[PDB]
Amino acid sequence: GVKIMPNLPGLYFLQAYPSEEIWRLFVDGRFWSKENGWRGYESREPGCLNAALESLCSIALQVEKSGEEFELSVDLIKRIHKKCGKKVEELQEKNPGELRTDEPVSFGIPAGRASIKGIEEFLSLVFLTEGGAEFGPGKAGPFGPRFDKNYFKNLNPEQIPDLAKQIYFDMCKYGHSNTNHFYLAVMKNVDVYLEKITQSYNKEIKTAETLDEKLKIIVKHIRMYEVLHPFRDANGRTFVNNLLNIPLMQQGLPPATFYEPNVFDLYSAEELVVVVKEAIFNTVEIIEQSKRKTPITLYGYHSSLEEQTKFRDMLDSPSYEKIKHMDFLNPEKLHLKTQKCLSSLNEQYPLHRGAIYLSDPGEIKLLLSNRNESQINQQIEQGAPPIYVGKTPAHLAVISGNMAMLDELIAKKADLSLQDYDGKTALHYAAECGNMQIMGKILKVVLSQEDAIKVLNIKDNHGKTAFHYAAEFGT
């Protein structure tokens, strides 16, 4: 009959998220290993982490307090952006909370942040074609990019599927992690396009029956919002680190912990659902490990006590302290829902996931038990979450520093000479990460093979050998 129906039931997970680890929902997982977790990110824009946390937290409390049913608005979007640059020096001179009129905003996209299906959808966005957006190969310059070609100029819609395949091939040819292709955003009707996207989300979310259907609508609109670059800066933080998390928590889902949230431009809506599910899974893993008092080692990062104390002294968010102390009900329904949501994650590439998340030698032996050669040496293809693309389970075992997985992969006679889309082998990675035991274990194998010299001399896309990297360990 009469009940308390929380606006964002998923706040249970934001309260459950360990305080000392909260920075993980803003600091891309890709940085952790080499930038001492949150340190690199913070130094780049001092106070941006506290402003990002406070933005999400205050705006969530505002929606939770409301008597009205949650709906997206141009006003909520402006409020998020305003808060995301509150004390940030690098955002104060870029009008926080105000939309662009004619200003130019541009960036480059590497093949590693793109997909064929994603480029197809990107070229299909009518607002981009009519709003005068520019995209194509070129050169970065002092006053924006110099386009050699602009695909939006005289664009044939029938050509878009073949153009996408060609664009990806060109981006690939240049280099997986290198930038050749640039995007110059729309310089008119940004206010009008922002309103159309909002009206479209509110319309479509009403006719999405299942969580999976709802997730596709959410990501399709977050993507359109990111692609239409409405603000001078902070669009990633505004749309993906903040905005995205509200409809997620509205559905009783945990917020997202991304490895790489910079895929909201040239990835497809369907591909992004998988990306977001991986990010929700990361949040659940962080929560579960901290609950088990298990030290978190995800994405190659072992936090020191010095790093941990530095973050708590730094942390300043009255809204987060409020969420932390909220009254929290049987979470069984919420757990079943998120487990049902993440059950799909399993099926696709289990060995690559095992190299990232697994650490029990017994669980690893069992996972690798009965896997054929083609499975143990499988390189994931374009369209999957960025971390997998062109990589073998061995590549990810080395990068993650997963000794138990690497040991089992060696026992399974995995091809350690395979190159990823960056021309790097497991040995190039062992050098870069400076792990002597991993490199020693790889070399013992390489030297037992006949093509040892050829293997050791493998050059990556920078024409560097694994040993060029080893010799450079420590800048």
Ligand X SMILES: Nc1ccn([C@@H]2O[C@H](COP(=O)(O)O)[C@@H](O)[C@H]2O)c(=O)n1
The helix (run of H) or strand (run of E) holding residue 273 is helix 269-291
- Closer to ligand X by CB, 235 or 268: give it: 235
Place of tokens 């990019």: 145
Cα 337-341-342 angle, rounded to 5 deg: 120
Terminal CA-to-CA distance of the chain, rounded, Å? 65
Q: Which residue is nearest to ligand X (CB)?
A: 236
Residue 201's contacts (CB-CB under 8 Å, 6 or more residues apart) are 72, 217, 218, 221
- Closer to ligand X by CB, 28 or 121: give it: 28
Q: Dihedral through CA 218, CA 234, CA 57, CA 78, nearest 10?
A: -80
**Residue length of the chain:** 475
Enumerate residues preceding breaks in the chain (C to N > 2.5 Å): 328
Shortest CB 147 distance to ligand X, Å: 22
| Beta-carbon-side half-sphere exposure of residue 120 (alpha carbons within 13 Å) | 13
- Closer to ligand X by CB, 234 or 376: give it: 234
Longest dimension (CA), the chain: 75
Shortest CB 234 distance to ligand X, Å: 4
- Closer to ligand X by CB, 239 or 469: give it: 239
- Closer to ligand X by CB, 32 or 147: give it: 32
What residues are paired with 266 via a beta bridge? Answer: 114
Shortest CB 271 distance to ligand X, Å: 18
> Distance between CA atoms of 61 and 53, rounded to whole angstroms?
12
Q: Is the Cβ–Cβ distance between 264 and 227 less than 8 Å? A: yes
Shortest CB 78 distance to ligand X, Å: 15
Shortest CB 52 distance to ligand X, Å: 8
- Closer to ligand X by CB, 216 or 237: give it: 237
Shortest CB 429 distance to ligand X, Å: 21
Tokens representing residue 404 in the block: 């138990």
Count of other CB atoms within 10 angstroms of residue 362: 8
Shortest CB 260 distance to ligand X, Å: 8
Is the Cα dihedral 23, 29, 35, 36 positive or negative? Answer: positive
Binding positions for ligand X, rule: CB under 6 A: 28, 41, 44-45, 48, 233-237, 261-262
- Closer to ligand X by CB, 49 or 405: give it: 49
Shortest CB 244 distance to ligand X, Å: 12
- Closer to ligand X by CB, 41 or 311: give it: 41
> Distance between CA atoms of 216 and 200, rounded to whole angstroms?
13
Look at residue 74 and give its three-state secondary structure: helix
Shortest CB 238 distance to ligand X, Å: 7
- Closer to ligand X by CB, 50 or 435: give it: 50
Count of other CB atoms within 10 angstroms of residue 209: 7
- Closer to ligand X by CB, 88 or 205: give it: 88
Residue 325's contacts (CB-CB under 8 Å, 6 or more residues apart) are none
Kindly state the DSSP code that residue 139 receives in the 8-state scheme: E
Shortest CB 371 distance to ligand X, Å: 34
> Distance between CA atoms of 236 and 137, rounded to whole angstroms?
23
The amino acid occupying position 360 is D
